[PDB]
């Protein structure tokens, strides 16, 4: 959150200008590109219970 | 304020879980929960919540 | 316990191969049209890249049309374009899909160095590669036609493969027929055919392949995955969401890369299958399959072609790998990934009132850091309407926001992050306070840990958004709640400036000094005697003082004593909490020693009485260093009056040596050299002077006559306490320079006789100008390539995090006090401070332990290892850890922040790789006995000879010194042949000589008396008649054996002993003659009738500390001259002479035999072919390699010499190191074990040294025999080492990425995205602290169910 996400720091600005002392992940984009990339040739992101 | 909070360190030794404690404490001091007892005295949440840990009423 | 079934954290990520099917799961939409644009209208073009349906929304739930509009159509679909209006961030999940036309080849699997496909059909590159470059018909299961199931076929030759079969015969080209070849290979057929070649062919060329090609096979097995999927017929386009479109001012578009690369794909797609409507020949259709292959090709990563470019532009397009790799590895996430939120650049300064646990930032840059938080207290108080509202509060200054400014930062624990630091604790917490500067005021004793000062050091202030950060911040990143360093016992918390020479200004003891002599009764009253100024802070005063000293179970139990101190020591006792016991107060006062005041005073008592205790002394102590103003420039240095007189002695001496050249008594050279000795020896003699003169020269009168007081002058308490600066240039700068280096590389012949308190001559200094030139360059480079030495250092020790709590190993490193030459110089306590004990350490008394195997070594047990005669004290290791993927806590210790239970998360691997770079930047006669007590010999051949003497027939005679209460003071490492003149076990004088050696003559001592004959020496083929003119007995000088006759290189010259009466006598040990044969060039002192006893000589034998060594250590550098050892024991001869390289015969009576090895005869034979040499016994001499010593000497003793060698630099350095950290290094050095034995795996697998510990462990027991595979350990380097990695993502980062990346997919080794770096690119958790708190309920999580 303090240096990956663009959307991280944004959607979390915006909420401790508000105040709240606890954070989330979300999720980086960068794994969005390396993941569908290999999406192409063949392989399954797997996230059970 | 405080030098030494070794004491907090002491009481719950997780140093860990024991953020996840208090994180869960200052959720409930700011969206809704309830109110934080000890009247406090300039001092952020995060460092009330360091306080109760001290007189280890809530953990 | 039960988990949660919901979702709480995310989990690992399992990566092998899928099916096609499971691809088009994903699919959405087919793209037709290959045109993104509509070229009229600038809008994007329907049923292509930038399709409604195919992909997605335009904008959010907004038709293109603008049709729909409100929320509750969520999902309405319209008769014609079935577009759900949609969240756009889910166009970036929608893909759309390519219906290949063309069976497409991985050309990764097939072009990758890991020629996975090629070695997996027991075929060539080059064949298979023409069957994928549509120019051969592959052969698809015939059976006994003319080909096999794997070759080619030209067009002449398929046409007449035809002729010759049409019937049961089928080929193919291209892809397609490669297709069929794999949709017909079962392969657990192909799999016990290469386990016929298992027990068929040993040999490497086809065995190695087999071990990769099965491995391939059963890494599938265990994974469930085909070689049919292995043919790419699915080609997804990824969404719109990483690919824009947006016309401009103008009539332009910006269209990406991509765009114009599925453009091409999409339009040849439809092309090929046009190919189709229209029915062309095979030689056509594949030649646009040929298109449409580098098509699927350049939209992954073009493979490895020639990078597609795009129409007119001449730059190599950015592909979907491209959108990954980049800049250092992983492009975005790692190098340069987004500019850091909340945190600033600063410098530091002075701020003496800010207390030990705060800082002082100013005023103004405090706001512009800290505004976010102010918003939110804001509108929480009721202050504020909305964050605009808010914004406008700062914009003006409002006085609302400073009483709630002081709120937000006078308890705010921040982390005070200086980026460049190579160390842990670099990194600390304060407290932030309004003060009003354009610096941050920081503590000066915390500058001794950051090792700065007050004059420009930059700073950057990180900003703790979350409480986490904010709870480690004071907890454990607080300075006055971490005075430990994780390299023994340093305090964090230390007066090492003018704070603390101001300290010697108050416990200074001179007699000059009202009140010297009256009696004092409190130490208040003392500092209030000095508050008015009235008695001498120097005066001498009995003082009635209580000393507390906790030697009971929660009672310090205290005392009554009668001490006289100076005022100086009264005023400081008022402040010491009682935990500390008046004994380390009372001294001299030093740097060190006021250091090890506060670790006794932490580790006996605790925290924070040492927190206010530092406080207070740093506010007195810059009183007292206020009224001790140093003084410099020309008025305060001085000169000698025995150092001008002693350089004029050492004038008209050179002035007579000049003579005596003149005269011809000395050589030239060696004129130099004796003129440098005794100017040196002037040099010295000017030490011996402006010491005792700044030492004791000031005297005063007071309470009877002028006594001496040590000298009140300001080098001198410089040279006390010590603050910057050393007193030996201080010495060359009051006395002569000395010499330097010449501009060729030498010393100087001419030395500088002059001081820098005056200004010495221009050509002189101009010769010392070369010497600043030396100087600046060297550290200017070396501070580089050091940090990039680290660089490799963390990049092998990442993987080590704590994980087990319990290993199961009872072995561990013998850790003692290593004692060479005179007293103790790497000590016990600082080698097993901090750790946990290997096993029950023994007293000087057997059958009582004094630290059970169990224990948390600290300070109480360190004193133990000190007040007892223990000289060996086993502590467990990393390197010996059990544990498997890491270390257990009960394996590490209590090394941390804390002095505690090591945290199960804590990563050690890397803080060690900090922790020895960190030095890494610092990196460019007699044994007369001087104790009195009991000479002991350890391990050692003696014999007696005539006269009563006691000479050695062994080479490690360690002469140990044991005191009169037995524990072990020095030790010699004693050559081979020494007169001892004392016995073992006799009291002997402080300074008399017990053990006489003599490094000039190493002769062969025969342990058999009687007459000399020499048998099988001939006198001119194998000894040579030289005999000495002077003395009258004669000698046979035994020659080379290389310069002998031509059947006397392979004679062995024997010194044969007969007795009184004449017969061949035994060596009274063995059951061989009495046969000592002499090496080369070797000069017998006996001759044929020479009676000799048992001792005496008979044959004569004859005879880089800094960083790029210790490059050498970590890169397996085979240095220069690597150290022959005995590879094997017992007795020895030559073997072969002059032909090629020496064949030393070492044959044992019981072991390897025949065993003879090459080493050169031309390097230095100290081989004693006359005794029996050891399986480690000294062939050559001088520095061994660490690859020898380990495999044939043993695991233990290598990396005992390694710690002991490398330590041996940080000896030059002065360094003192946790040894556990140097090892978390050298394990990884040893991560591979090559499993030697034949069992599982393979014969020549190298796999993880955990790995197969584990695999023993379960196949030495049922279902099985003796099949179990044994493992070596193996020593490499960090480079290597490093390079050694299974987690591809982490290779994906640094080092490189694309090979690793197919190293682990070939296979389909699923690592579950374990680890720290892992964590790291993707930016989640790693398995430590909170993060494997969430581990160990996902370790029970994952695999199960």
Same mark, same amino acid.
């Given at each position: ?12 600005? +915006?909420? =401790? ?6 954070? @989330? ?10 993941? +569908?990339? =290999? ?6 992101? @797997?996230?059970?219970? | ?59 | ?1345």
């Amino acid at each position: 959150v303090k240096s990956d996400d663009v959307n991280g720091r944004t959607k979390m600005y +915006k909420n =401790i200008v508000d105040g709240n002392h606890q954070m @989330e992940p979300g999720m980086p984009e960068s794994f969005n590109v390396l993941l +569908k990339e =290999i999406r192409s040739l063949g392989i399954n992101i @797997e996230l059970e219970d | 304020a405080r030098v030494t909070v070794q004491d907090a360190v002491e009481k719950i030794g997780n140093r860990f879980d024991l953020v996840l404690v208090a994180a869960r404490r200052a959720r409930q001091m700011q969206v809704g929960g309830k109110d934080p007892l000890v009247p406090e005295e300039n001092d952020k949440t995060t460092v009330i919540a360091l306080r109760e840990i001290e007189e280890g009423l809530i953990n | 316990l039960k988990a949660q079934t919901k979702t709480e954290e995310f989990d690992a990520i399992k990566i092998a191969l899928a099916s096609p099917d499971m691809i088009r799961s994903w699919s959405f939409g087919e793209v037709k049209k290959p045109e993104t644009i509509n070229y009229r209208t600038f809008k994007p073009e329907r049923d292509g890249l930038f399709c409604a349906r195919i992909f997605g929304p335009v904008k959010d739930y907004e038709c293109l049309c603008g049709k729909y509009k409100r929320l509750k159509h969520r999902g309405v679909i319209c008769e014609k374009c079935g577009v759900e209006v949609t969240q756009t961030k889910v166009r970036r999940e929608r893909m759309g899909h390519i219906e290949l036309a063309s069976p497409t080849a991985h050309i990764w699997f097939l072009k990758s160095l890991p020629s996975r496909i090629g070695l997996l059909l027991d075929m060539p590159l080059r064949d298979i590669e023409r069957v994928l470059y549509f120019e051969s018909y592959v052969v698809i299961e015939g059976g006994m036609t003319n080909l096999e199931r794997q070759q080619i076929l030209t067009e002449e030759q398929y046409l007449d493969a035809l002729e010759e079969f049409g019937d049961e015969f089928d080929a193919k080209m291209g892809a397609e027929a490669i297709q069929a070849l794999l949709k017909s290979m079962d392969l657990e057929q192909e799999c016990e055919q290469l386990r016929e070649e298992l027990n068929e062919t040993n040999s490497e060329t086809k065995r190695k392949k087999l071990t990769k090609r099965i491995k391939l096979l059963e890494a599938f097995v265990q994974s469930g995955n085909k070689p049919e999927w292995m043919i790419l017929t699915v080609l997804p386009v990824l969404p719109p969401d990483l690919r824009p479109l947006v016309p401009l001012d103008g009539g332009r578009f910006a269209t990406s890369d991509l765009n114009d690369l599925y453009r091409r794909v999409i339009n040849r797609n439809n092309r090929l299958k046009r190919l189709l409507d229209l029915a062309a020949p095979d030689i056509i259709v594949r030649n646009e399959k040929r298109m449409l292959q580098e098509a699927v090709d350049a939209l992954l990563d073009n493979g490895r072609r020639g990078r597609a470019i795009t129409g007119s532009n001449k730059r190599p397009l950015k592909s979907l790998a491209d959108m990954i790799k980049g800049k250092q590895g992983r492009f975005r996430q790692n190098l340069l990934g987004k500019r850091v939120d909340y945190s600033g650049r600063s410098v530091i300064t002075v701020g003496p009132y800010l207390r030990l646990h705060q800082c002082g930032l100013p005023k103004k840059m405090a706001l512009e850091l800290f505004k976010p938080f102010i918003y939110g207290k804001l509108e929480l108080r009721g202050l504020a309407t909305t964050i605009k509202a808010a914004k406008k509060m700062v914009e003006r200054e409002e006085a609302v926001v400073w009483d709630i400014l002081d709120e937000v930062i006078r308890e705010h624990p921040v982390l005070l992050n200086r980026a460049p630091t190579l160390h842990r604790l670099g990194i600390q917490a304060f407290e932030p306070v309004l003060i009003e500067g354009k610096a941050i005021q920081l503590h000066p004793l915390v500058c001794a840990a950051y090792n700065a000062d007050f004059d420009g050091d930059q700073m950057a202030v990180h900003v703790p958004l979350t409480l986490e950060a904010q709870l480690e911040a004071r907890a454990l990143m607080m300075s006055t709640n971490n005075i430990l360093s994780p390299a023994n016992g340093e305090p964090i918390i230390v007066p090492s400036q003018d704070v603390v020479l101001g300290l010697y200004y108050m416990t200074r003891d001179c007699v000059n000094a009202k009140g010297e002599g009256m009696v004092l009764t409190g130490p208040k009253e003392a500092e209030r005697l000095y508050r008015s100024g009235l008695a001498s802070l120097h005066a001498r005063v009995k003082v009635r003082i209580t000393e507390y000293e906790k030697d009971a179970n929660g009672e310090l139990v205290a005392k009554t004593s009668l001490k006289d101190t100076t005022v100086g020591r009264a005023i400081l006792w008022m402040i010491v909490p009682k935990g500390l016991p008046y004994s380390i107060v009372n001294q001299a006062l030093g740097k060190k020693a006021i250091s090890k005041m506060l670790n006794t005073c932490y580790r006996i008592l605790g925290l924070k009485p040492t927190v206010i205790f530092a406080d207070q002394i740093m506010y007195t102590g810059f009183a007292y260093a206020a009224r001790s103003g140093a003084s410099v420039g020309i008025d305060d240095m001085v000169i000698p009056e025995k150092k001008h007189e002693i350089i004029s002695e050492a004038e008209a001496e050179v002035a007579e040596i000049q003579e005596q050249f003149q005269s011809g008594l000395v050589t030239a050279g060696e004129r130099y050299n004796k003129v440098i000795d005794i100017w040196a020896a002037a040099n010295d003699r000017v030490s011996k002077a402006m010491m005792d003169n700044l030492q004791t020269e000031t005297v005063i009168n007071r309470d009877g006559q002028e006594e001496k007081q040590v000298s009140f002058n300001s080098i001198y308490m410089m040279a006390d306490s010590g603050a910057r600066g050393s007193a030996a240039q201080i010495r060359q700068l009051a006395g002569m320079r000395g010499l330097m280096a010449k501009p060729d590389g030498s010393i100087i012949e001419t030395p500088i006789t002059a001081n820098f308190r005056e200004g010495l001559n221009v050509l002189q200094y101009f010769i010392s100008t070369h010497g600043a030139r030396k100087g600046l360059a060297d550290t200017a480079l070396k501070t580089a390539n050091s940090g990039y030495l680290t660089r490799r250092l963390v990049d092998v020790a990442q993987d080590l995090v704590v994980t087990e709590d319990d290993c199961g190993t009872h072995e561990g490193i013998m850790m003692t006090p290593v004692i060479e030459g005179g007293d103790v110089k790497e000590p016990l306590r600082d080698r097993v401070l901090g750790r946990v004990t290997a096993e029950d350490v023994l007293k000087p008394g057997t059958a009582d332990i004094l630290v059970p195997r169990n224990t948390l070594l600290h300070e109480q047990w360190c004193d133990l290892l000190e007040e007892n005669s223990v000289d060996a004290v086993k502590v467990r290791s990393v390197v010996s850890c059990d544990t498997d993927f890491g270390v257990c806590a009960h394996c590490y210790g209590r090394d941390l922040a804390r002095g505690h239970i090591i945290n199960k998360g804590e990563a050690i691997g890397v803080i060690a790789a900090q922790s020895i770079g960190e030095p890494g930047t610092q990196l460019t006669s007699s044994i007369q006995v001087k104790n009195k007590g009991s000479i002991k010999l350890s391990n050692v051949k003696s014999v007696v000879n005539s006269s009563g003497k006691l000479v050695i027939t062994s080479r490690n005679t360690e002469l140990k010194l044991i005191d009169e209460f037995g524990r072990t003071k020095e030790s010699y490492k004693v050559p081979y042949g020494a007169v001892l003149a004392k016995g073992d076990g006799e009291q002997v004088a402080g300074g008399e000589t017990v053990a006489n050696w003599d490094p000039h003559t190493m002769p062969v001592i025969t342990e058999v008396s009687g007459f000399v004959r020499f048998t099988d020496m001939i006198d001119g083929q194998t000894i040579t008649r030289q005999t000495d003119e002077l003395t009258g007995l004669s000698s046979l000088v035994v020659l080379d054996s290389a310069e002998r006759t031509a059947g006397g290189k392979d004679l062995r010259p024997a010194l044969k002993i007969v007795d009184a009466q004449g017969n061949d006598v035994l060596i009274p040990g063995t059951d061989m003659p009495a046969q000592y044969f002499l090496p080369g060039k070797a000069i017998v002192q006996l001759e044929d009738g020479v009676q000799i006893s048992s001792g005496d000589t008979l044959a004569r034998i004859p005879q880089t500390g800094g960083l790029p060594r210790v490059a050498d250590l970590f890169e397996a550098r085979r240095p220069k001259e690597p150290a022959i050892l005995a590879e094997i024991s017992g007795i020895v001869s030559f073997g072969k002479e002059t032909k090629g390289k020496r064949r030393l015969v070492i044959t044992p009576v019981d072991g390897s035999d025949p065993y003879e090895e090459m080493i050169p005869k031309w390097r230095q034979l100290n081989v004693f072919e006359g005794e029996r040499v050891e399986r480690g016994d000294v062939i050559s001499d001088g520095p061994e390699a660490p690859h020898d010593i380990l495999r044939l000497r043993g695991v233990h003793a290598v990396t005992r010499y390694i710690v002991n060698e490398v330590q041996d630099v940080y000896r030059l350095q002065g360094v003192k190191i946790n040894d556990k950290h140097i090892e978390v290094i050298v394990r990884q050095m040893l991560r591979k074990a090559t499993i030697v034995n034949a069992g599982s795996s393979d014969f020549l697998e190298g796999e993880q040294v955990e790995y197969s510990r584990v695999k023993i462990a379960n196949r030495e027991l049922e279902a099985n025999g003796k099949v179990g595979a044994t493992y070596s350990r193996d020593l490499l380097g960090i480079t290597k080492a490093s390079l050694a990695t299974e987690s591809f993502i982490s290779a994906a980062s640094f080092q490189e990425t694309t090979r690793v990346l197919t190293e682990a997919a070939v296979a389909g080794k699923r690592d579950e995205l374990r680890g720290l770096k892992e964590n790291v690119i993707v930016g989640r958790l790693i398995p430590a602290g909170t993060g494997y708190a969430y581990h160990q309920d996902r370790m029970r999580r994952r695999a199960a169910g």
